[PDB]
Symmetry: C5
């Protein structure tokens, strides 16, 4: 309930409840279905691009959501959401398969838990990637592909699905970047290896971008 | 009162009381209203300015204050204030929305708790930002804007307000910097996204500065 | 069996069982044989090659497995595998003898424990090495050798064995690298020092790689 | 007692006593008086100097001492001193007001606790500062001032005092540096802010140095 | 018993025994004598040298050993040696007097404990030092001296013994370095300061090296 959101004791009790029920290390599979993790990257900046080494340095908000209805509560007379340290929660073990640096989280490591069991987590992350930088200094731009999925959970355990297919991230991308975004495409993809049987679901993020205000030869 | 400030046992007891009462992970919403967080950035140094990439590296003291009346005590014959490790306290989950590096805290992670429940927290932070660097080597200078607000609490849970809206920062900015400030303003601002319902309050800090001639 | 894989209470109980049985600081010697650790490096990216200093900066997945039969459970009607924080497990104290930076782990620090007691651990690691970079700009390429073994356990306590002896890592190495891999060979080798006659087993990883576009103008 | 310093059980007992008595988060104020913190910086290395940006990169030993009498014990027949992890002790919340990087501690984080309750702590610290570098290539040299005081305790709670006003740090400063030290002065100084009522005591360390 | 080395339960019990007896924060002084620490550096690489600033960036293995007989056990029918996380053990608080960066430890932080109570600890460390780089491009080479000893324990509490062989230096030093080692000499010395009592033992490591060519 909206009116009761700022009831402190209620929030403290909800946090207590969440921590009693939460299993931070066990996947919240419900009904023998995989955990449906939804992921959508919102690019904030493109900081370094190297066309020779095919490397980019970027900042993005990793919009992440999933359900654990064992965390759910009756919010008819209590807050609808609270913030929770992610150390108290299970969080999907996502990794970018083509990252070449550690994900640097720039933000407080808190998630929102909603009374219906939905969890929202959105770290601001600075990270470097190996991807196709060719064409960045052209009209059509470069297309850098970033693949994100579970590091240890195959598709029967975790499914990683995109939220919105196409965007140009206009509400998020810095107007002061040297670069501009032409399109961001986010699609389901699946990876397997010859060594190892199971398939892994990932989201393949296609970042099409170019140098801004480039001087051309016409 | 200040005459009892160095009563060690009193300080120990106050710290004990604070740790018994404090809920570090719960917003201290009193009277069913948002937590009023007051913030002002005091710029100490401008370390690097890259007009190629529109990036700045700065050091600032983040003066931060709010109230949690449940922490209050009667200081008629006891210390007015004590220092407390911030891990013992709730602290607002502030973030700079246009930061491009982690906030590096340079100073002991302690806050002051006043006997009326007021909390004062002021880390010296070195951090990099993406902001408009155009004009830094002109008379009018550059204007670099930094937006600071709660990362996870919307306006009904936390309000973030500027302590003062206008400053020359003269008491704080390093006289030895190769840069000089023309103005620092701090304004209330609201942020919303099409994806999401609620609004998030922030403080928009506008740093107008130039390379000294 | 895999129909029971998403039974969450079962997963929680396996994790509990593993944590009750696991001795994280004790080598899991079975019978009185050394722990047999299988290791195979899959190179993902070659970030920097410094011909002046003979140094390389690389990213690789360190495919690692060993068994601890005391962790095994009956999985007739329970999950075959779970993910486990490596803090809950013994892991081999592997080190690269010619590393010149710390191994930076880019991925969630989780392992897979299989119901037969097998443990699989595969961190993505960025690390710098001192090695022979000569030849990198030639058809034959450079051969960079990295020796990896236990830091404190001799051959009677831990044996370290390569899996695949030869490969070009085509499933793993980035197509966007300015380098290309000719061959990755991984062989057993033994190290002793005049101070200390006890043999230490290691895998010698020979990375044969070359710069793309070796022929240029000037 | 000299003879008992290496009595290991005695050292373990003292450490146990210290940890039972110590309040690491409470200032050790005695007799309604501020904690007297004595501080002296000894510069070891001047690693980088930038005359354009007025920044220096230095290494120094922060010689720090104070007393907590509640830690004292009778050492007539036991060790006079032991080493203690600082996480078991209260240590002053000192910070350099013009630091522009994190203090990087290069040494084991241990203090010495003396049987009279004196505590000695001396980290080697690498840190960058914003200060006046002009004149560094001249004979008179540059004078870089570094202000060190409590970050959260005002003068009623903690006094920060120099041990020794003048020195050229000869036993400490690297002979192999490309800079040389002319003089290091360390003086009491007091800082007040228009926002806040009380004064904060600090040591102003004036580092007079030049390129060789 | 080496045939009993792989008895897992035996190893678990030894670790239990070590952890019950170990005092990680107390110097293991036996018979009212200083802890006799043996320590020597084995250089693996010289990565960067700057003759202008007199700085070197090197990698070495810190061969370290000492005794704590309270850890001893009877190994007639049990393992002779086990690996132990150093968090479970006292370790000498060694530091380099002329270090200008943190010691970056590149290896698992385990020590070996032997059934006679000997402890062996050998971190691979990358670290930068301020030292005499003059002569590096000459036949005579440079002589960079690195001074290492206890940070807080004087000579009556900890002694250091750096005596070791060096004709095996090519077993350790990288063949791929830009530099070559002429000699590594490691000798006892003592340090005192006018301000303070006691002497602190150190190991003066003289790294005599030159650029190849
Ligand atoms: C696919 O799943 C998601 C998850 C989160 C979001 C999301 C949340 C969101 N906020 C709540 C939130 C939840 C948790 C953490 C941080 N933040 C608000 C807000 C506003 C200003 C700065 C920061 N966060 N803002 C935006 N733009 N997106 C969207 C989709
Ligand atoms: C709007 O909220 C605030 C919060 C703090 C301040 C504040 C506090 C303050 N000190 C107390 C304090 C409380 C806590 C932590 C550190 N410091 C004193 C002082 C002086 C010299 C260095 C350090 N701190 N100094 C200054 N200039 N501003 C002002 C407004
Ligand atoms: C010689 O021993 C090994 C060990 C592991 C592997 C292994 C595991 C593996 N995955 C499972 C796993 C277990 C644990 C941790 C991470 N990953 C799958 C997978 C797929 C996409 C990204 C990540 N991991 N994938 C690949 N290619 N190899 C191979 C040989
Ligand atoms: C104003 O307060 C002080 C505090 C300490 C000192 C002090 C202590 C000191 N040592 C003891 C000590 C205590 C504790 C920690 C480290 N060290 C000896 C020694 C010698 C060689 C390296 C290291 N330490 N050496 C020097 N030069 N100064 C001086 C004044
Ligand atoms: C003066 O005291 C010492 C201590 C250790 C050594 C020592 C130990 C040693 N190993 C055992 C060990 C003990 C503990 C930790 C790691 N390692 C073997 C070995 C071999 C290959 C990589 C790693 N370690 N190797 C070498 N070269 N020296 C020598 C003298
Ligand atoms: C939630 O609680 C309210 C009042 O406490 C009650 O009327 C309502 O039935 C509850 N909802 C459910 C689903 O039990
Ligand atoms: C506060 O404390 C003093 C003495 O400690 C007492 O005189 C007074 O009544 C107390 N209550 C209030 C509300 O001040
Ligand atoms: C495993 O448990 C199943 C399930 O009840 C049972 O049929 C059988 O006894 C077990 N199988 C073994 C021990 O091989
Ligand atoms: C210290 O201990 C000795 C021996 O127990 C005792 O005789 C002496 O009186 C004590 N000193 C003080 C000052 O109490
Ligand atoms: C050591 O232990 C073995 C059995 O554990 C025993 O036979 C022997 O007497 C013990 N003492 C010595 C000195 O070996």
């Amino acid at each position: 309930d909206y009116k009761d959101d700022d009831d402190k004791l209620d929030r403290a009790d909800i946090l207590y409840n969440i921590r009693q029920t939460s299993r931070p290390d066990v996947i919240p599979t419900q009904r023998d279905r995989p955990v449906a993790v939804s992921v959508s990257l919102k690019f904030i900046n493109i900081l370094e691009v190297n066309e020779i080494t095919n490397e980019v340095d970027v900042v993005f908000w990793q919009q992440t959501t999933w359900s654990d209805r064992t965390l759910a509560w009756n919010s008819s007379h209590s807050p609808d959401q609270v913030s929770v340290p992610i150390s108290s929660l299970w969080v999907p073990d996502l990794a970018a398969y083509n990252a070449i640096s550690k994900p640097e989280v720039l933000t407080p490591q808190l998630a929102r838990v909603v009374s219906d069991g939905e969890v929202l987590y959105m770290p601001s992350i600075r990270q470097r990637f190996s991807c196709d930088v060719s064409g960045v200094d052209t009209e059509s731009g470069a297309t850098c592909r970033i693949k994100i999925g579970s590091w240890t959970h195959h598709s029967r355990e975790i499914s990683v699905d995109p939220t919105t297919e196409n965007s140009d991230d206009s509400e998020y991308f810095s107007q002061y970047s040297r670069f501009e975004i032409l399109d961001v495409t986010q699609k389901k993809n699946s990876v397997t290896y010859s060594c190892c049987p199971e398939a892994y679901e990932d989201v393949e993020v296609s970042l099409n971008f170019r140098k801004k205000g480039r001087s051309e030869i016409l």
